[PDB]
Design a binder for this molecule. Structure first.
Ligand SMILES: CC(C)CCC[C@@H](C)[C@H]1CC[C@H]2[C@@H]3CC=C4C[C@@H](O)CC[C@]4(C)[C@H]3CC[C@]12C
Ligand SMILES: CC(C)CCC[C@@H](C)[C@H]1CC[C@H]2[C@@H]3CC=C4C[C@@H](O)CC[C@]4(C)[C@H]3CC[C@]12C
Ligand SMILES: NCCCCN(Cc1nc2ccccc2[nH]1)[C@H]1CCCc2cccnc21
Lengths: 282, 116
């Protein structure tokens, strides 16, 4: 409706501006300047690179929401691929940060080599390669249609069964497995933090561990809080498709608008890192 | 912040028994170590797990106690000696939050007088 037609571009432009500025600033600060580059800093640099690469493609979606899509099949496929790559890489970089914190806290003296290896070599194989290999459906199914009076850029499957399958696989790979890893690591970490009198053997090491662990906790909580309502909406939509939830057409329209507004709001995860750096780094 | 108060001192007849008290109140998340100090040699010290570490000249005569629910450390004095007349300082190690460092606190100071 017209309400969405005016609401979506405004939020998209605000997010694009804030994400461009913040991610560019973070990348510039941690790149050529060569400022503090601990393992968490490396992981957040990877995260900022991914977030900026996705934020680059927001004006196309704003223009698609407002008027039409004059860009083409190649650009449709490119923006879908970039979206998928960002969506997987961000959450799995968060999982890698969680695992690194667990290794640094629980095994504080014998984990230097495993942490260095995990942050140097295993990170690419565990984050980027599966994300790239999961973009094959984006390369196959992303297309530009010719509906009435305008073009549409969206993934086109033979039927809704593929939609349900890809929604479920997105839910899994982006919420459960990294969620399970983060849950286990942070449960162990918090059990160790509130019971051990002094981590490692000196007070400075203990306070450093706490001061580096806390912002990661805040970032992970904010990330999942942003993404959760969209996941609830798509779960309800999938169950509607799976014939479990049977109601009238007004119900379907309501959940559709709910999902649209919620995904527009949950795209704010791209701005968490610069804002966290700003109000925890001054 | 936290507040530690000491009580139990005063003038008592020789050969009697006393029980010093030290209760901590304030923003306390967890307490790790407590002990009485008198360099200030730790004449007594009990950890959170009860692993007491008595002094050489105080072992076998003094008994320490700690009730975590009551947030107190009790030192029982028996078999008085002339060298035991001194000032007792209550010490405790606390942490105000999960992400905070290991904070250290001290007591007011208790005067115990025994005839020599
Ligand atoms: C979707 C599921 C499977 C995983 C997502 C939830 C995880 C990543 C989030 C949501 C709830 C969060 C916890 C909520 C409360 C606490 C207690 C606090 O004193 C320390 C942080 C801690 C322990 C948080 C750590 C991160 C956390 C475990
Ligand atoms: C963007 C929209 C969709 C949702 C926004 C959710 C985010 C930004 C909000 C919701 C609740 C918030 C958290 C609530 C509780 C605390 C504890 C406080 O001591 C520090 C901030 C912290 C950790 C907040 C971080 C940011 C937070 C997770
Ligand atoms: N023109 C339509 C193109 C699909 C747009 N969405 C996918 C999508 N949204 C929805 C909102 C409500 C209901 C179903 C929805 N399915 C995603 C595609 C990937 C990237 C992206 C970026 C910005 C906004 N939306 C999206």
């Amino acid at each position: 409706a017209n309400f969405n037609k005016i609401f979506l571009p405004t939020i998209y432009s605000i997010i694009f501006l804030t994400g461009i500025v913040g991610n560019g600033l973070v990348i510039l600060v941690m790149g050529y300047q060569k400022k503090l580059r601990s393992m968490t800093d490396k992981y957040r640099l990877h995260l900022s690179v991914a977030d900026l690469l996705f934020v680059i493609t927001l004006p196309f979606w704003a223009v698609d929401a407002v008027a039409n899509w004059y860009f083409g099949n190649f650009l449709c496929k490119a923006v879908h691929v970039i979206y998928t790559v960002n969506l997987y890489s961000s959450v799995w970089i968060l999982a890698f940060i969680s695992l690194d914190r667990y290794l640094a806290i629980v095994h504080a003296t014998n984990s230097q080599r495993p942490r260095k290896l995990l942050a140097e070599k295993v990170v690419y194989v565990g984050v980027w390669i599966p994300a790239l290999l999961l973009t094959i459906p984006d390369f196959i199914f992303a297309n530009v249609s010719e509906a009435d009076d305008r073009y549409i850029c969206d993934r086109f499957y033979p039927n809704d069964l593929w939609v349900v399958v890809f929604q479920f696989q997105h839910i899994m790979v982006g919420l459960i497995l990294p969620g399970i890893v983060i849950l286990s690591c942070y449960c162990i970490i918090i059990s160790r933090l509130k019971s051990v009198r002094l981590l490692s053997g000196s007070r400075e090491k203990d306070r450093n561990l706490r001061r580096i662990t806390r912002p990661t906790v805040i970032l992970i909580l904010a990330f999942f809080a942003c993404w959760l309502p969209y996941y609830i909406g798509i779960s309800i939509d999938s169950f509607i498709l799976l014939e479990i939830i049977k109601q009238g057409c007004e119900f379907e329209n309501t959940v559709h608008k709910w999902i649209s507004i919620t995904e527009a709001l949950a795209f704010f995860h791209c701005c968490l890192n610069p804002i966290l750096y700003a109000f925890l780094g001054a | 912040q936290v507040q530690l108060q000491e009580s139990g001192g005063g003038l008592v007849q020789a050969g009697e028994s006393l029980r010093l008290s030290c209760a901590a109140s304030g923003t306390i998340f967890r307490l790790y170590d407590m002990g009485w100090y008198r360099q200030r040699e730790l004449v007594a010290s009990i950890t959170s797990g009860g692993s007491t570490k008595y002094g050489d000249s105080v072992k076998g005569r003094f008994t320490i106690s700690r009730d975590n629910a009551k947030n107190t450390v009790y030192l029982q004095m028996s078999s008085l000696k002339p060298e035991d007349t001194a000032v007792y300082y209550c010490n405790a190690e606390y942490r105000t939050g999960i992400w905070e460092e290991l904070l250290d606190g001290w007591g007011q100071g208790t005067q115990v007088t025994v005839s020599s």
